[PDB]
Short mmCIF file of C-alpha atoms and ligand atoms in Angstrom, two decimals:
data_model
loop_
_atom_site.label_atom_id
_atom_site.label_comp_id
_atom_site.label_asym_id
_atom_site.label_seq_id
_atom_site.Cartn_x
_atom_site.Cartn_y
_atom_site.Cartn_z
CA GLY A 1 104.38 86.23 156.14
CA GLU A 2 105.33 89.66 157.39
CA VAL A 3 104.75 90.98 160.90
CA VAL A 4 104.41 94.74 161.26
CA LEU A 5 106.18 96.50 164.15
CA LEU A 6 105.50 100.11 163.17
CA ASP A 7 103.30 101.69 160.44
CA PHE A 8 103.08 105.48 160.58
CA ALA A 9 100.55 105.88 157.73
CA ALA A 10 98.19 103.34 159.27
CA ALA A 11 98.10 105.07 162.67
CA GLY A 12 96.81 108.62 162.17
CA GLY A 13 103.41 113.10 168.16
CA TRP A 14 107.00 111.92 167.70
CA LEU A 15 109.90 113.57 169.41
CA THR A 16 111.68 116.35 167.58
CA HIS A 17 114.94 118.03 168.46
CA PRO A 18 115.83 120.80 168.91
CA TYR A 19 112.66 121.88 170.65
CA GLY A 20 110.45 124.20 168.63
CA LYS A 21 112.39 123.87 165.40
CA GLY A 22 112.64 121.58 162.45
CA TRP A 23 110.40 118.59 161.75
CA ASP A 24 106.67 119.25 162.07
CA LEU A 25 103.65 116.92 161.99
CA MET A 26 101.55 118.04 159.01
CA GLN A 27 98.43 116.95 157.20
CA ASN A 28 96.87 117.28 153.77
CA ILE A 29 93.04 117.20 153.97
CA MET A 30 92.15 117.54 150.30
CA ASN A 31 90.40 114.17 150.51
CA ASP A 32 88.14 112.56 152.99
CA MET A 33 90.85 110.74 154.81
CA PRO A 34 93.78 112.88 155.90
CA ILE A 35 97.33 112.23 154.74
CA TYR A 36 99.77 112.83 157.61
CA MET A 37 103.48 113.48 157.28
CA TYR A 38 106.51 114.76 159.09
CA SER A 39 107.88 117.69 157.11
CA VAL A 40 110.94 119.89 157.36
CA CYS A 41 112.00 122.59 154.93
CA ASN A 42 114.57 124.91 156.51
CA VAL A 43 116.47 125.28 153.26
CA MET A 44 117.94 128.79 153.54
CA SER A 45 119.87 128.94 156.87
CA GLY A 46 122.62 126.40 156.08
CA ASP A 47 123.28 125.22 159.67
CA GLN A 48 120.46 122.72 160.19
CA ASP A 49 120.60 119.61 162.34
CA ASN A 50 117.00 118.58 162.93
CA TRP A 51 116.15 115.20 164.43
CA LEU A 52 112.89 113.28 164.32
CA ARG A 53 112.71 110.15 166.51
CA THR A 54 110.06 107.45 166.47
CA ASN A 55 108.53 106.35 169.70
CA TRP A 56 109.99 103.21 171.21
CA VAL A 57 109.19 100.23 169.00
CA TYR A 58 108.79 96.77 170.48
CA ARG A 59 111.09 94.39 168.56
CA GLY A 60 109.12 91.26 169.23
CA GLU A 61 111.17 88.31 168.11
CA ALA A 62 112.76 90.00 165.08
CA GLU A 63 116.47 89.32 164.51
CA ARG A 64 116.48 91.61 161.48
CA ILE A 65 114.02 94.46 160.86
CA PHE A 66 113.07 95.78 157.41
CA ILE A 67 112.38 99.51 157.15
CA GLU A 68 110.36 100.99 154.29
CA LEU A 69 110.21 104.78 153.87
CA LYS A 70 108.01 106.81 151.49
CA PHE A 71 108.91 110.45 151.07
CA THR A 72 109.10 113.50 148.80
CA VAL A 73 112.10 115.83 148.35
CA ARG A 74 111.77 119.21 146.70
CA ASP A 75 114.32 120.26 144.08
CA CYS A 76 116.77 122.68 145.69
CA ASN A 77 116.43 124.87 142.57
CA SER A 78 112.94 125.69 143.90
CA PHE A 79 114.52 128.02 146.45
CA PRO A 80 116.27 131.09 145.08
CA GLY A 81 119.56 131.66 146.83
CA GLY A 82 119.61 128.18 148.34
CA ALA A 83 122.44 126.74 146.26
CA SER A 84 124.85 126.10 149.16
CA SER A 85 122.37 125.88 152.06
CA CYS A 86 119.88 123.46 150.53
CA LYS A 87 120.38 119.66 150.45
CA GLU A 88 118.38 116.80 148.74
CA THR A 89 119.10 113.91 151.13
CA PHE A 90 118.47 113.08 154.78
CA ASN A 91 120.01 110.52 157.14
CA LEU A 92 118.49 107.45 158.77
CA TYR A 93 119.66 106.17 162.20
CA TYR A 94 118.63 103.60 164.80
CA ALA A 95 119.24 102.77 168.42
CA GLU A 96 118.43 99.61 170.34
CA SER A 97 117.05 99.91 173.84
CA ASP A 98 115.46 97.73 176.50
CA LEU A 99 113.97 100.87 178.03
CA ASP A 100 111.53 103.37 176.61
CA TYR A 101 113.42 106.63 177.19
CA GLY A 102 110.30 108.69 176.63
CA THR A 103 111.08 112.35 176.21
CA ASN A 104 114.82 111.79 176.79
CA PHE A 105 116.86 111.93 173.62
CA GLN A 106 120.60 111.29 173.36
CA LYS A 107 121.92 111.39 169.80
CA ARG A 108 125.15 109.68 170.84
CA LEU A 109 123.26 106.40 171.29
CA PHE A 110 122.24 106.27 167.59
CA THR A 111 124.06 104.47 164.77
CA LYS A 112 123.73 105.60 161.16
CA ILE A 113 122.02 103.24 158.71
CA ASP A 114 122.35 105.21 155.47
CA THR A 115 121.95 108.42 153.59
CA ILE A 116 118.42 108.40 152.14
CA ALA A 117 118.35 109.90 148.67
CA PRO A 118 115.39 110.35 146.32
CA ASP A 119 115.25 108.61 142.99
CA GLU A 120 113.05 111.55 141.94
CA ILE A 121 113.05 115.13 143.21
CA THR A 122 109.85 117.19 142.88
CA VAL A 123 110.54 120.28 140.74
CA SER A 124 108.75 123.58 141.31
CA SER A 125 106.37 123.30 138.37
CA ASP A 126 105.19 119.89 139.53
CA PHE A 127 104.79 121.02 143.17
CA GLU A 128 102.62 123.93 142.11
CA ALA A 129 100.60 121.62 139.87
CA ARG A 130 100.09 119.32 142.91
CA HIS A 131 102.13 116.57 141.29
CA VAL A 132 104.67 115.21 143.73
CA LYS A 133 107.10 112.37 143.16
CA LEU A 134 106.77 109.82 145.96
CA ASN A 135 109.98 107.89 146.55
CA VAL A 136 110.23 104.48 148.22
CA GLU A 137 113.39 103.28 149.98
CA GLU A 138 114.00 100.12 151.97
CA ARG A 139 116.79 99.25 154.38
CA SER A 140 117.27 96.58 157.02
CA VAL A 141 119.12 96.36 160.34
CA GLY A 142 120.32 93.58 162.59
CA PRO A 143 121.03 91.44 164.36
CA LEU A 144 118.94 93.04 167.09
CA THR A 145 118.68 91.76 170.66
CA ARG A 146 117.21 94.41 172.99
CA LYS A 147 113.53 94.62 173.89
CA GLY A 148 112.88 97.50 171.49
CA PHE A 149 114.45 100.09 169.25
CA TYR A 150 114.13 103.57 167.85
CA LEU A 151 114.51 105.00 164.36
CA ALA A 152 115.61 108.56 163.85
CA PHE A 153 115.75 110.87 160.87
CA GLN A 154 118.31 113.67 160.63
CA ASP A 155 117.74 116.64 158.40
CA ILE A 156 120.70 118.80 157.43
CA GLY A 157 118.81 121.39 155.32
CA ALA A 158 116.60 119.57 152.85
CA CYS A 159 112.90 119.99 152.04
CA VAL A 160 111.47 116.57 152.93
CA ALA A 161 108.00 115.19 153.61
CA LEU A 162 108.05 111.73 155.22
CA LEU A 163 104.67 110.07 154.52
CA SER A 164 105.29 106.46 155.44
CA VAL A 165 107.52 104.58 157.90
CA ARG A 166 106.77 100.83 157.93
CA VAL A 167 108.92 98.40 159.91
CA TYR A 168 108.35 94.66 159.63
CA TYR A 169 110.05 91.30 160.11
CA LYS A 170 109.79 87.97 158.38
CA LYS A 171 108.93 84.41 159.29
CA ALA A 172 107.35 85.32 162.60
CA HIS A 173 105.88 81.82 162.49
CA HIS A 174 109.25 80.37 163.53
CA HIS A 175 109.22 82.23 166.88
CA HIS A 176 107.27 82.16 170.16
CA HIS A 177 105.79 85.61 171.01
CA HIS A 178 105.51 87.25 174.44
CA UNK B 1 108.31 129.28 155.45
CA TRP B 2 108.47 127.00 152.51
CA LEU B 3 106.22 123.96 152.55
CA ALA B 4 107.55 120.49 151.84
CA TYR B 5 104.22 119.08 150.60
CA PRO B 6 101.40 120.84 148.72
CA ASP B 7 98.31 121.94 150.63
CA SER B 8 99.74 120.81 153.96
CA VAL B 9 99.06 122.39 157.34
CA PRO B 10 100.15 121.58 160.88
CA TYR B 11 98.27 118.86 162.66
N1 LIG C 1 124.14 115.90 165.10
C1 LIG C 1 125.09 114.81 165.53
C2 LIG C 1 125.58 113.89 164.43
C3 LIG C 1 125.20 112.40 164.61
C4 LIG C 1 125.43 111.79 165.97
C5 LIG C 1 124.81 110.40 166.07
C6 LIG C 1 125.81 109.28 166.11
O1 LIG C 1 126.37 108.84 165.12
O2 LIG C 1 126.02 108.83 167.31
#
């Protein structure tokens, strides 16, 4: 009995920082329904610190939230000269908040959950053949007590496409909802 | 740039 709090791939313009750089909302329209994703791939510069933040998510009655990510990561050997500037992980954070801060973003309020690493990187020959390796990772966070929360994703120089962000809680039939 | 996902364009 799961209750869904956020489902990016079911929805079809999240905050990004710094302005004008980094994560970008993308689509693949090779089939009748579009596939959306947040992508970043600034693998050559070596000084990247790109943040993607969900909108405010109502927590409902969840004490613990479960977070499922689906994503691709390109092999850093795809990028000639990227040995030291390219990474193959990204970082996952959260913040709790009673208030929807809107366009205001303060990194200092966020707590790291984990490094997110791919079980499978997508090598160049597979990318060009349109064969990507979709990874799935799950984490959970709590106890939570504020009205809502945010997730954020920090890129430090990897080539990542984030296709799915699902957040749910369990046993919502033991709670009274407002 | 490089693209993270094949055949993807900004939305
Ligand atoms: N780019 C800043 C590094 C992470 C700060 C977030 C934090 O732990 O509060």
